[PDB]
Amino acid sequence: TACPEESPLLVGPMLIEFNIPVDLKLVEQQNPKVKLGGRYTPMDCISPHKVAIIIPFRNRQEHLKYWLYYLHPILQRQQLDYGIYVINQAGESMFNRAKLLNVGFKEALKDYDYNCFVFSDVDLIPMNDHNTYRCFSQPRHISVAMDKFGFSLPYVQYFGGVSALSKQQFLSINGFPNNYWGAGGEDDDIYNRLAFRGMSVSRPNAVIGKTRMIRHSRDKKNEPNPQRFDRIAHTKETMLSDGLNSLTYMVLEVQRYPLYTKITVDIGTPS
C-alpha cells in the first residue's frame, strides 16, 4: 500500500513553454482529481509525503496561471499528498519574501498535519519530473540550474528560488528572518541558519535540476549573476530571537479557490 520510492508515472524531460494561451478554466478541466483549495491525495497508494507548497505573492496573477498549469500535473505524477498556498502581501510596503514564507508555514499547519514544506517563487517551473518536490534527510535546494542565470548555479551556498525543508528542519532554525525588507540577502541568511544548526544542502544534478523562469515583460534591466552576501556574523547574533518565535501578523482574508488557497495578510506588525 505504500507508494513506490520512485513513481512509475514519471516522464522525465518536459517541454516547458510560455508562448501558449492558458486560463484557470483550462487547468481545472485537465485536473479532475484536485479538490477545493488545491488539495490532492493519492488514491492507489499511501504517500508518506504530506507537502504544503508555499508561494510568496503580490500582483502576479498571470504568472500564477502558468505555474498551476504545469505543476498540478507534475505533483500528481510524483504521487504526493499536497496542498497549494498563495501568501498575498497586502499594502504597498517593500516586498518581504521570507516573512511571507513564515506566514505560509503557520497557516498551512492550521489546515492539515503537513510534515514537509516547499517554498517556491511564482515564476519558476521545473523541467524534469524526476526533480521531486518533497523533503529529504537534509534541507533540499530544488531550482539548481535556472535559465535566468545561464543554467548555472551561482555559487555552492546559493539557496534561492525553490527549496524544501521538513517540519523539524524548519523548527530547528527558528524559521526564516522577518526583517529583510525589499529584495536580496534573505536567502543567504537562511543558508547560514542551516549551517549553524549542523545541516548541509542536498541537491539533484544540474540536468535533472534544470528550471525555467516566466519572463517579466517589465524587467528589461540586466545585470550579472548574484554573488554571496557576507552576513554570517549578523545571522549568528539574531537568528534565535528573530523568526518563528517573534512572528506576528494579521490575516485579512482567506479564499478557497478550486486550484489553491489564497491568504491575504498584513505583515506590518513588529517581528
**Cell triple for 263:** 491568504
Number of domains in the chain: 1
Edge-to-edge strand ranges of the sheet holding 210-213: 124-126, 210-213, 145-146
Distance CA 240, CA 248 (A): 16
Annotate 57-67 with b (16+ C-beta within 10 A) or e (fewer). beebeebbbbb
Q: Is 35 helix (H, G, I), strand (E, B) or coil?
A: strand
Q: What count of other Cβ atoms lies within 10 Å of the Cβ of residue 267?
A: 21
Place of cell 524544501: 164
Q: Resolution of the experimental model in angstroms, please?
A: 1.9
**Cell triple for 118:** 516547499
Residue 171: closest CA among 119, 128, 115: 115
CATH number of domain containing 117: 3.90.550.10
Question: 97 is in which domain, residue-wise?
Answer: 1-271
Distance CA 13, CA 75 (A): 15
Q: How far is CA 177 from CA 2, 26, 97, 164, 244, in A?
A: 37, 38, 10, 16, 8
Q: How far is CA 171 from the centre of its chain?
A: 17
Which residues contact residue 21 at a Cβ distance below 8 angstroms, ignoring those fewer than 6 apart? none
Distance CA 61, CA 260 (A): 12
DSSP state of 2: B
